[PDB]
Enzyme design. Sequence first.
Site, PDB file in Angstrom:
ATOM      1  N   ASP A   1      28.570  45.358 -14.173  1.00 29.16           N
ATOM      2  CA  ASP A   1      27.792  45.852 -13.029  1.00 29.16           C
ATOM      3  C   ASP A   1      26.925  46.971 -13.611  1.00 29.16           C
ATOM      4  O   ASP A   1      27.474  47.990 -14.080  1.00 29.16           O
ATOM      5  CB  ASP A   1      28.680  46.320 -11.888  1.00 29.16           C
TER       6      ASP A   1
ATOM      7  N   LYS B   1      17.200  51.984 -13.984  1.00 23.70           N
ATOM      8  CA  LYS B   1      17.177  50.735 -13.192  1.00 23.70           C
ATOM      9  C   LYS B   1      15.998  50.734 -12.221  1.00 23.70           C
ATOM     10  O   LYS B   1      15.581  49.611 -11.808  1.00 23.70           O
ATOM     11  CB  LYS B   1      18.468  50.562 -12.401  1.00 23.70           C
TER      12      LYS B   1
ATOM     13  N   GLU C   1      24.001  40.937  -6.845  1.00 22.77           N
ATOM     14  CA  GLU C   1      25.082  41.870  -6.406  1.00 22.77           C
ATOM     15  C   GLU C   1      25.790  41.292  -5.179  1.00 22.77           C
ATOM     16  O   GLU C   1      27.025  41.281  -5.158  1.00 22.77           O
ATOM     17  CB  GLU C   1      24.543  43.310  -6.335  1.00 22.77           C
TER      18      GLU C   1
ATOM     19  N   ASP D   1      26.067  47.548   0.961  1.00 24.55           N
ATOM     20  CA  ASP D   1      26.347  48.166  -0.347  1.00 24.55           C
ATOM     21  C   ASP D   1      25.747  49.559  -0.339  1.00 24.55           C
ATOM     22  O   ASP D   1      24.528  49.716  -0.522  1.00 24.55           O
ATOM     23  CB  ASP D   1      25.877  47.297  -1.515  1.00 24.55           C
TER      24      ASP D   1
END
Length: 377
Positions: free
Chosen positions: A7, A68, A172, A194
């Site tokens: 992850d 990211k 994800e 999330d």
Amino acid sequence: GPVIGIDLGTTYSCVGVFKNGRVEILNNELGNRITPSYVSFVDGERKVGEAAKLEATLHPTQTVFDVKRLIGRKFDDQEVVKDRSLLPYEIVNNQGKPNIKVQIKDKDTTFAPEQISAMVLEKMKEIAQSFLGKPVKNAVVTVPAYFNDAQRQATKDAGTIAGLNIVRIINEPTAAALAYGLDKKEETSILVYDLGGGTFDVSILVIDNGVFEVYATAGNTHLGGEDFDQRVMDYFIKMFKKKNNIDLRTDKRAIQKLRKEVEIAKRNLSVVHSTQIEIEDIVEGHNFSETLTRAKFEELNDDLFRETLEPVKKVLDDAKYEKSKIDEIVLVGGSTRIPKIQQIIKEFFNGKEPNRGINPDEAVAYGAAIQAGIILG
Ligand SMILES: CSC[C@H]1O[C@@H](n2cnc3c(N)ncnc32)[C@H](O)[C@@H]1O
């Protein structure tokens, strides 16, 4: 060879392996299953993880994170323009793409985002290699469902630089659905909520006879547990000023110590109703000693908590879904442990209960490891 699951989060990474029919989420050298996605270039040393994050206070321009947010994007994208105004390390326009510029022994050095993400992947690879006692050359790595082909390819390129062939990119939401073992038979619509340290993502995922499809996605790129901590910081900084004629913002070390204790207090308040925040000599000769209640924690953040429902309404609208059409709600990210978050989601869904895990910060890595196991047979 082995295939590990990683992850690659915005604020953190997490690595799991599938061995002897179980997923093991592995500890880094400091004994933690979550590694901060930070790289520091201070004093002729390169640090990755918590040791780099600690350099951010005294070396903000040399301490790289949130890469990211940049990976696979263009320098003039509206999101990268905002990130450049927020991020303290220099971002340069290399032929239309954002690159990171730091100094190593005073020399200007420029990195592509995938070069910094590769350093994070290398550290996760080394954890797996030490645990498995053999070399690792292959991984399943997670991306957000909204990632485009350039963002996915730049992630695969980060893997290649790290000596990892990324055999599968999984979104994800799919990783979460594998971790919770959601029934693959028949057709199920899942809302995957999330809420991490820096980012909020919601997706509608439909599982149809073993085929996973994300029907819609939305979120808030600058809404997570770090923002809830800052709301608490802001309040106690004002109070400490009222009481002591000390503005703690004037001492960066004081702010770093406060933030650490505020994040622990917030975690406590997911289980208890009242907690002490205590720092001896937060500045010389002045202790910090305060009580924070759950009620005050929620009051300081209840607008941010409610803002999470705007992307929920957006994905329901995008997919032309009634709330009733959702079969199950799966919470991912450490911040879903906040009781008020769970309450708000339950009430939006006209009383329906969310499914939550017990290690929601590791669920995505766990599902990536399951995907590795599936690929090996
Ligand atoms: C990688 S997800 C880590 C994020 O989840 C948050 N988090 C983890 N556990 C808890 C908790 N018990 N209560 C509230 N937030 C939490 C952390 O503070 C961070 O913002």
